[PDB]
DNA sequence: GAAGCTTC
DNA sequence: GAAGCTTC
């Protein structure tokens, strides 16, 4: 996920 | 070494 | 079913 906790997604 | 999926 | 990297 994030940054941060790619994206989603790439 | 962990804690965190939504571009197709 | 990749799969793109960070903040801790």
């Known amino acids: 996920t994030x ?3 790619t994206x ?3």
């Open 8 to 10: 989603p997604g790439v």
């Open 3 to 5: 940054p941060g906790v």
